[PDB]
């Protein structure tokens, strides 16, 4: 409405950017969990 406002370039860029950060972390933790598992040693 002249103010299509709903820019959400910022919200979408942020939302898209958010998604990247959240998945990256899941990947980092999963890598760590598997690393722990390859090298057992838990007597």
UniProtKB/Swiss-Prot annotation:
PTM entry text: Phosphorylated on tyrosine residues in response to thrombin-induced platelet aggregation. Probably involved in outside-in signaling.
Protein's cellular compartments: Cell membrane; Cell projection, Lamellipodium membrane; Cell junction, Focal adhesion; Postsynaptic cell membrane
Membrane-spanning segments: 9-31
Tissues of expression: Isoform beta-3A and isoform beta-3C are widely expressed. Isoform beta-3A is specifically expressed in osteoblast cells; isoform beta-3C is specifically expressed in prostate and testis.
Domain of life: Eukaryota
Role summary: Integrin alpha-V/beta-3 (ITGAV:ITGB3) is a receptor for cytotactin, fibronectin, laminin, matrix metalloproteinase-2, osteopontin, osteomodulin, prothrombin, thrombospondin, vitronectin and von Willebrand factor. Integrin alpha-IIb/beta-3 (ITGA2B:ITGB3) is a receptor for fibronectin, fibrinogen, plasminogen, prothrombin, thrombospondin and vitronectin. Integrins alpha-IIb/beta-3 and alpha-V/beta-3 recognize the sequence R-G-D in a wide array of ligands. Integrin alpha-IIb/beta-3 recognizes the sequence H-H-L-G-G-G-A-K-Q-A-G-D-V in fibrinogen gamma chain.
Entry remark concerning the domains of this protein: The VWFA domain (or beta I domain) contains three cation-binding sites: the ligand-associated metal ion-binding site (LIMBS or SyMBS), the metal ion-dependent adhesion site (MIDAS), and the adjacent MIDAS site (ADMIDAS). This domain is also part of the ligand-binding site.
Protein family (similarity comment): Belongs to the integrin beta chain family.
Miscellaneous notes: The constitutive activation of ITGAV:ITGB3 on neoplastic cells may contribute to tumor growth and metastatic potential.
Disease linked to the protein: Glanzmann thrombasthenia 2: A form of Glanzmann thrombasthenia, a disorder characterized by failure of platelet aggregation, absent or diminished clot retraction, and mucocutaneous bleeding of mild-to-moderate severity. Glanzmann thrombasthenia has been classified into clinical types I and II. In type I, platelets show absence of glycoprotein IIb-IIIa complexes at their surface and lack fibrinogen and clot retraction capability. Bleeding disorder, platelet-type, 24: An autosomal dominant disorder of platelet production characterized by congenital macrothrombocytopenia and platelet anisocytosis. Affected individuals may have no or only mildly increased bleeding tendency.
Subunit details: Heterodimer of an alpha and a beta subunit. Beta-3 (ITGB3) associates with either alpha-IIb (ITGA2B) or alpha-V (ITGAV). Isoform Beta-3C interacts with FLNB. Interacts with COMP. Interacts with PDIA6 following platelet stimulation. Interacts with SYK; upon activation by ITGB3 promotes platelet adhesion. Interacts with MYO10. Interacts with DAB2. Interacts with FERMT2. Interacts with EMP2; regulates the levels of the heterodimer ITGA5:ITGB3 integrin expression on the plasma membrane. Integrin ITGAV:ITGB3 interacts with FBLN5 (via N-terminus). ITGAV:ITGB3 interacts with CCN3.
Protein name as catalogued: Integrin beta-3
Designated gene of the protein: ITGB3
Residues of the whole record sequence present: 712 to 753 of 788
């Amino acid at each position: 409405p002249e103010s299509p406002k709903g820019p959400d370039i910022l919200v979408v860029l942020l939302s898209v950017m958010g998604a990247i950060l959240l998945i990256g972390l899941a990947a980092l933790l999963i890598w760590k969990l598997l690393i722990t598992i390859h090298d057992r040693k838990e007597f």
